Structure formats: C-alpha cells, structure tokens
C-alpha cells in the first residue's frame, strides 16, 4: 500500500528550527505533487507549501515564505520551519495529490507530526495498572507526561483523550473490557509509547 | 494569493436533511477545487476533486458543483457518520484551504453513559501518589457533569475532567481524575464518582481495600 | 498557427506561433517530442541586452524549465533598435519524463537595458504523451 511515514512528535525550543521528514513506501512521489499542511489544535488546515519532486523547488504560502523550506526526491520529502514561536505548535502532515494528467486522486496523508514549541523539557509518563474489581474492566493510567502524544496498545479497547493538569503535564487512560472468567486464565499488558521522550513502557494488569 | 471563503462556519441539521456548504474563490480556479472531510481526532480524507469528481469509496450522498469562483458541497441525506469538519481547497495556483465548516448531526437518540471508576494502584501508592480514575463512555448528547464525593462530602479540588470527545461510534467519552495524598486515600471510608447526564446520575464508589 | 497569450507588459509581442496549435484551443505539448515556438515583437527601447526569464507551473506548482538559453540576443540581432520588429524561433526539447498536466502556465519575460522588453502568459498548454 502507498504509505507516507513521518518523523515522530517532538518538543522544540522557541527560536530553534524543526525538520519533518515524509518517507513514501509501496510507491513513489513520481506522478504526484507533495504538500505540507499544518493544523494547530482546535484550528483549521493551513497549506505551508508544496513541491513536484525532482521537477521543481518548494512553493510557499507568502505568510511562510523565508521561514519554510521544502525539499524532495521520489521517496523522501522534508519540511524545515525556522524561528519557531508558540503559534507554530501544530500537527504537520505531508499529503500527496495526483498530477492532473493522470487518473485518480492519488490522495494520501501521513499520520501527522505534533511539534510542540515550548521552553519546558520532555517528561516520560509513569504507567500504573488499573486492576479490575457480565464483564470486568481493566486498563492503565498513563500519568504526568509532556508533551503529547502518547500511543497505547494491549498484549473492546478504549483509549481516552488526555487531561492537562495545572502542572502543565498530561495524563491519559486506556481500558479493555473482558469476560470475568478470562481474568483468572488470561494475561493483560498495556504497551505505552511516548516517542518525544523516546519512552516505551509495558505494564502487567492483574486482579 | 487566492483566498477561499467557506460558508457556513457551523451547520446544524437532523439525520436525513440536505445540507449544502459553499466555497467562493477570490479569483478563477477553473475546476481545480477539492473537498476534504476531517472526522474528530483523525487526519483529513478526500471526498471530491475537480469540483464534481467523487473519490473512490465516498458515499453517493456526497456531491460537488460550482460556478468557477463559486463551489458547493451537498450531503443529500445527512447521516451520523457525516459529523465532521469539511474544508474546500483550491489547487489551481498553489493551494489554499477554506476556514472549514463544522457539521453537527442533531436528532439522534439519547444514550446514557457507562461509568468505570478505578481506585489508586498499589504501585502509585508505592510512588507516594494516589489518583482515582473515572471513565465515562457511550453517552449522547456529548455533555456530562462529574461530582466527586469523600464520605458523602463534595470534593471541589484536585478534580481534572476532560471535555467530552466523539467516539468512532458517534457517542461521547470523557475522563475525570481526582488527585489525593495517600494519607487522604486511606483516611476516608469511601470516594464516589457521580456522573449526571440529562438528569440521570450514575454513581460509582470505591473504598481503600 | 497563431496561439492566444496574455500580455503582462505593453503589447510589445505582436504574435506567438506554434505549429500544430491554434488560438485558445488546448495546445498539446508531447513528451519526448520537439516543440517549436515563434514570437514576433517590437523593441520598446534601444538595448544591448535581452535576458529571457521563464516561470512555469504544473497544477499550480512552479517547475524548472530545462534547456533554455537565457540570452535572447543569441537568436536575434542585438543591440535592439526601438520600434524595429524582431522574429525569434526556438525549438524546445520536451523531456520524455515531463509531468503530465492539464493545468500548465508558462510566463516568458524578456528584460532589456531599461526594464521589460516583453512579457506573455500562456495558459492553454497541456502536457500529454
Ligand atoms: Cl491554506
């Protein structure tokens, strides 16, 4: 399948610059235009710029001209944003679109990269088990991390949006609902990935 | 610079209604107009390209039209899956996205919340902290109030509660966290998480044990 | 035949010709094939120099145009004399891998000693097999 893989989320200091990568697999950017689009939390989609890889240089929205550079070959594209300010906090996506001389949309989106512009350090979460006491409910508490995002998997599943404490740190929870009879005889571990602190933690949840 | 003016910013309608979203371009964009749908917590997905061409797999209820500077997206019969933010995008000269139209789908049946309350883990207590976790799912409409009690007395403090957020099944979830000292946890006979939705209260209680 | 272009200067370009294209009909540029263009223009100034600047876009995104000689004085007798007419012929090699597009914009600007000699925008070109 055509998949665009982007660099992981990170914390960048104000005045620093960030280089986001977008790698194509299962195909190439040949026959496609490549665009970088940002979405600040609660805000609309904004086009930063785009390129026809190997045929042209980066094209840029005048608001972003001179602070954004976009470069690209047939398998990798990059967006660099310099002089980062708090207003640059956003999910950055790479998106393809078929050239108009070909058939189909050729529309594919990366998973997106949350860039947090902040003076605060990354902080890995503590992971605690939520022991269960028709069905039983078990999960884990992913406590006091910064910035977002965290991702969760197990070994039916509900991952709740994070809460932000007055501390400025986040906490989230994931829940698996299982038959009471399977509790005595089956093992549950939750797999918490916090990329921005490079943290991966697995915790056993037993009665 | 080509500017896209999208109207309305927010649209409320019932299931089965016909909704139309308008996008105007500050200059000619020919037929180079796209429509994307962004469901909550998800990446944007293409619905229409070249003004009227449906992307593969998009339902027939979605249609696109235009007057060269004026373009419209129509949902012939609004469904709960259509709750999302819709954005027009010109691709004639560079690319410009409209401000987006949030579509709210009204008239759906009430659903009361499932409430799950977890006491502090032995492991968190080992770390000299204590968090009660109250998880709220499958409710509609997407508003709830959470009150925490200690031995029946209201707890006004150490309460952190999320805004409601849409599930993939078009009901809502939320979380409330109560931060305690381990001394407060063991020194009280019980704590309760009490969620009220449309005048119905679901109460869950835990005790150190 | 004569094709339609939009003047971005003061109507110095009198005619643009492209064999196999006509007026404002789609003008197909075939990949891997030579493309012939002729322009007739009146000099609006005496100029030692004529520098040609080509901006091209594919689906609203700028692309580099390879194989263009920037010195237009290579294809006509410079210095230009104000009010005299110059005919310039050029065959452009279309890359075999040229990006196929139904939305192509070509802007050709010729700059002289004292600013713009000539400017035209062509929007009817389509890149196909
Ligand atoms: Cl935009």
TrEMBL record, chain C:
Keywords: Disulfide bond, Secreted, Signal. Gene3D superfamilies: 2.60.40.770. Residues 5-124 form the MD-2-related lipid-recognition domain. The keyword S-adenosyl-L-methionine does not apply. One of its GO terms (cellular component) is extracellular region. Disulfide bonds join 8-119, 21-27, 73-78. It is found in: Secreted. It comes from the Eukaryota. It holds the Pfam family E1_DerP2_DerF2. This is Der p 2 variant 3. It comes from Dermatophagoides pteronyssinus.
